[PDB]
Design a protein around this ligand. Structure first.
Ligand SMILES: [Zn+2]
Ligand SMILES: [Zn+2]
Ligand SMILES: [Zn+2]
Ligand SMILES: [Zn+2]
Ligand SMILES: [Zn+2]
Ligand SMILES: [Zn+2]
Ligand SMILES: [Zn+2]
Ligand SMILES: [Zn+2]
Ligand SMILES: [Zn+2]
Ligand SMILES: [Zn+2]
Lengths: 123, 123
């Protein structure tokens, strides 16, 4: 009675470099016979001033997606190779493969989310 | 002074089959020199009982991602080739390429989102 086209055992918490608890995945490479992308992230309202990770890298390009119910309802700082960037929702930022990076939530309302879309099947 | 690694002109409303207004995209194939995926969707709190589209298809597989701040805070119906499925957040559903499909929001709190991750660069 589990439906093979629906996954409900989410998020999938994976150990990731630079983190101090597992990172929450919603798409993993082993889903549905093999996916070409992975997707991690979560809701930001309890993360204001609380970084999930030190600077870390992936071997594939990644895209950050920042959304919130109200325009401007979430703001994150993203460090990229030591250069500070800032995103106000809605926003998309490219994180080049091998770039040392991390994010810090500066502002978030209920329903603010950041997701990282990893353009490949490897971490 | 625009930073080529950050897009803030979002969502990108594209005309899509079966819809009656443009669909909101956050990742489009023409971003950052060419992406291998696209991503559309949005916040569900004002969509309860209000379907965005009739049944429609894509030429690539798609993954629905349904999230909300509280476990169980959003519920959608997804029609797939005329068979009803239902998702309670958090959930992921595979939509096979060419499958006629659409969704209906049955329940949503502030901060409920559904996104469709299109596993290819064509609509
Ligand atoms: Zn089924
Ligand atoms: Zn992380
Ligand atoms: Zn922590
Ligand atoms: Zn990353
Ligand atoms: Zn990360
Ligand atoms: Zn820059
Ligand atoms: Zn749509
Ligand atoms: Zn409408
Ligand atoms: Zn679709
Ligand atoms: Zn659709």
């Amino acid at each position: 009675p589990a439906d093979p086209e629906i996954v409900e055992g989410l998020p999938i918490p994976l150990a990731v470099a630079g983190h101090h608890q597992p990172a929450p995945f919603y798409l993993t490479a082993d889903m549905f016979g093999g996916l070409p992308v992975q997707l991690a992230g979560g809701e930001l309202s309890t993360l204001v001033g609380k970084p999930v990770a030190a600077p870390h890298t992936h071997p594939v390009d990644e895209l950050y997606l920042l959304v919130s119910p109200n325009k401007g309802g979430a703001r994150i700082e993203v460090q990229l190779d030591g250069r500070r960037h800032e995103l106000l929702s809605p926003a998309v930022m490219r994180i080049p493969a091998g770039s040392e990076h991390c994010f810090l939530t500066l502002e978030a309302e209920v329903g603010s989310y950041c997701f990282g879309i990893l353009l490949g099947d490897r971490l």
